[PDB]
Design an enzyme around this catalytic site. Structure first.
Site, short mmCIF file in Angstrom:
data_model
loop_
_atom_site.label_atom_id
_atom_site.label_comp_id
_atom_site.label_asym_id
_atom_site.label_seq_id
_atom_site.Cartn_x
_atom_site.Cartn_y
_atom_site.Cartn_z
N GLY A 118 0.40 -0.86 0.10
CA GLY A 118 0.00 -0.02 0.02
C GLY A 118 1.25 1.11 0.29
O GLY A 118 0.14 2.01 0.13
N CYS A 119 2.11 1.41 -0.23
CA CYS A 119 3.26 1.96 -0.44
C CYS A 119 3.46 2.74 -2.16
O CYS A 119 4.44 3.72 -1.74
CB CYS A 119 4.10 2.02 0.29
SG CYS A 119 3.77 1.52 2.18
N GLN A 120 2.57 2.87 -3.07
CA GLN A 120 2.92 2.51 -3.61
C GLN A 120 4.38 2.50 -4.71
O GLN A 120 5.09 3.26 -5.68
CB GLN A 120 2.60 3.97 -3.90
CG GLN A 120 3.00 4.39 -5.85
CD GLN A 120 2.85 5.93 -6.41
OE1 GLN A 120 2.91 6.15 -7.67
NE2 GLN A 120 2.56 7.16 -5.52
N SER A 121 4.97 1.31 -4.06
CA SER A 121 6.74 1.33 -3.79
C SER A 121 6.60 -0.41 -2.84
O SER A 121 5.69 -0.46 -2.46
CB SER A 121 7.30 2.57 -3.49
OG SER A 121 7.18 2.62 -2.52
#
Lengths: 144, 143
Positions: free
Chosen positions: A48-51
């Site tokens: 969920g941290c786009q990374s």
């Protein structure tokens, strides 16, 4: 090393503009110790941290939390360092009852970062607290 | 490079929802710049006062239009270069000379909320380009 939470907030607010604030967060991220290739595994992945984000929390010879982490996104790694500073030198139970919200409000992060970035920050906080709770939560006897 | 025109660029900046999205968009504009020719990167095409290594090569084609290429050591500065190229896109030297960028930088609030040197670097590259443009504008094309 990393400054304590008091100094982090003072230095952050001392920055004259948001680019300086942004680069300071990234700078802190770069100060984090290298993550063992062994700990950079799925078991330690945060979603969920786009990374890609990795966080490992372990208790030392005493009951104090030792946090390590990394991200393939510089700004995300910086946010990782910010959370580590706020939860520094705490027992699992201290982490669970520590309200970090006011610290983030004063930094005004959610108002300057992208929604996606803010969500990633919430995800890591939730993940750290989850780990701290699994180490201190009550296993009520009526539930045995 | 494949970048929006001035008019579109401005609208895009207005749509940015937060400090970070805007900051990263400027970096994105720089990332959209074509790579400089292997060592077109010379001390000659070097710009100074941008708190980093900045290169801008100006060329005038057979149609009298100015073609610009550039690169910087700092991602943000390179984005500022891209903005400048968009503003001067498809212009003749004379066009570049009488073009007032002020209103554009003002509406984009480009260097606002960035460290002080950004607006200084921006001013540096503008005067550099206008200088070259003026030089060429004294020697006119055909008609």
């Amino acid at each position: 090393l990393l400054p304590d939470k008091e100094k982090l907030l003072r230095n952050f607010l001392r920055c004259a503009n948001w680019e300086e604030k942004y680069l300071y967060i990234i700078e802190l991220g770069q100060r984090l110790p290298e993550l063992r290739d062994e700990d950079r595994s799925p078991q330690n992945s945060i979603q969920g941290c786009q990374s890609q984000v990795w966080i490992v929390m372990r208790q030392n010879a005493q009951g104090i939390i030792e946090l390590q982490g990394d991200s393939d996104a510089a700004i995300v790694k910086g946010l990782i360092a910010v959370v580590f500073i706020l939860y520094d030198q705490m027992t699992p139970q201290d982490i669970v009852n520590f309200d970090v919200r006011p610290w983030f409000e004063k930094m005004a992060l959610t108002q300057h970062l992208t929604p996606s970035r803010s969500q990633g920050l919430e995800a890591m906080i939730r993940a750290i607290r989850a780990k701290a709770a699994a180490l201190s939560l009550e296993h009520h006897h009526h539930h045995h």
